[PDB]
Every structure is written in C-alpha cells, then in structure tokens.
Amino acid sequence: MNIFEMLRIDEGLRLKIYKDTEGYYTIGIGHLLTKSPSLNAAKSELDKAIGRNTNGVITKDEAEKLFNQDVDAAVRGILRNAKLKPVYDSLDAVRRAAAINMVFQMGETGVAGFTNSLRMLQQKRWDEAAVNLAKSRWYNQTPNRAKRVITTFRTGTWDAYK
Ligand SMILES: [Cl-]
Ligand SMILES: [Cl-]
C-alpha cells in the first residue's frame, strides 16, 4: 500500500465531471475543478487543466496525470508550510501518507487549522490525537473516510485500508 493506492480508494476514479461530497465540480481522482456553481466554469477549468477541448470528459491516463500532479503538489504544500512541515518530518512513513491524504482532501489551510491535533501528532500521543481529530466538521461530513485516515494515524499501519 502507498499514498496513491490509498487515495485511489478514498476518492474513486470518475471520467466525467461530477459533484463532490460538498457539491463541487470534480473529475478524475478527486481533482477539484472549481467551487463555482457553473458547469461551464467547470468545463473551462477542465480544458485549461488538460490542454484540450474535452467536453467534460477525460481519459484514464489524463486522470492519472492530474492525480500525479495533485499528490506532488500536496506534498510540496506540506513541505512549504511552516506549521505543517515540522509535524510531517516527525512522522513515520505510513503516518506521512495519512497526512498527505488530509491535505489532498482539505487543503493546506484546512489542515493547518487542526492546531491541537497537530501538536498531538508531533508529540506522538496517538490515541489522543485520534480522539481530537474526530471532533471536527471533517469527521462529521465524511465519517468513513475520516475513520480510515484517523485509524492510520492511530496505529501506524494500513489496516483500515485492508
Ligand atoms: Cl491543474
Ligand atoms: Cl465517508
């Protein structure tokens, strides 16, 4: 198991524009296109992202390409963030994948606001962090996925994904 397979399981793969859990225009493996209500604004962003006139549909390769870029950007966002980096550096390889997952889903700002959980992870207080992480809108909105990520932080294994 690795970050890619992990996210592929949490996000699915869709080759036609769709709405995400929050109602936003998305395509591929969790690639947010726009928060605007316009399918056209979404269509425009899509073409801009792929480099061609797609009519709202992409191929699997295109999807994977977006995915590769998004994982990369996620990692780099963590590494550039003064609040995230230190926590991330302190973690083991499995837990790091859980961190990437959160950022991929909620953005670096989003994560950055979990100050208390962050401190707990950094101190390696696993059960405590797990409990604190659950007290969040994130958990309440996407509980099954949240549970998976949280278990990963708690145990340090890929058991939730097996
Ligand atoms: Cl893009
Ligand atoms: Cl869920």
UniProtKB/Swiss-Prot annotation:
An example Gene Ontology biological process: defense response to bacterium
Pfam family, one: Phage_lysozyme
A GO-annotated cellular component: host cell cytoplasm
Residues the record marks as active site: E11, D20
Main location: host cell
UniProt entry keywords in alphabetical sequence: Antimicrobial, Bacteriolytic enzyme, Cytolysis, Glycosidase, Host cell lysis by virus, Host cytoplasm, Hydrolase, Viral release from host cell
pH-activity dependence text: Optimum pH is 7.3.
InterPro entries: Endolysin_T4_type, Glyco_hydro_24, Lysozyme-like_dom_sf, Lysozyme_dom_sf, Phage_lysozyme-like, T4-type_lysozyme
Binding site for substrate: L32, F104, S117, N132
Effect the entry attributes to changing E11N: Loss of 84% of enzymatic activity
Compartment(s) of residence: Host cytoplasm
Outcome recorded upon mutating E11Q: Complete loss of activity
Substitution effect: G30F: Almost complete loss of enzymatic activity. The enzyme is destabilized by 1.5 kcal/mol
UniProt effect for mutating E11 to A/F/H/M/N: Complete loss of enzymatic activity
Annotated phenotype, changing S117I: 500-fold decrease in enzymatic activity
Swiss-Prot/TrEMBL induction comment: Expressed late in the viral replication.
Catalytic activity: Hydrolysis of (1->4)-beta-linkages between N-acetylmuramic acid and N-acetyl-D-glucosamine residues in a peptidoglycan and between N-acetyl-D-glucosamine residues in chitodextrins
Mutagenesis or variant effect for D20 to A/N/S/T: Complete loss of enzymatic activity
GO molecular function: lysozyme activity
UniProt EC number: 3.2.1.17
Top enzyme category: hydrolase
PANTHER family in UniProt: T4-TYPE LYSOZYME 1-RELATED
Protein family per UniProt: Belongs to the glycosyl hydrolase 24 family.
Function: Endolysin with lysozyme activity that degrades host peptidoglycans and participates with the holin and spanin proteins in the sequential events which lead to the programmed host cell lysis releasing the mature viral particles. Once the holin has permeabilized the host cell membrane, the endolysin can reach the periplasm and break down the peptidoglycan layer.
The protein, known as: Endolysin
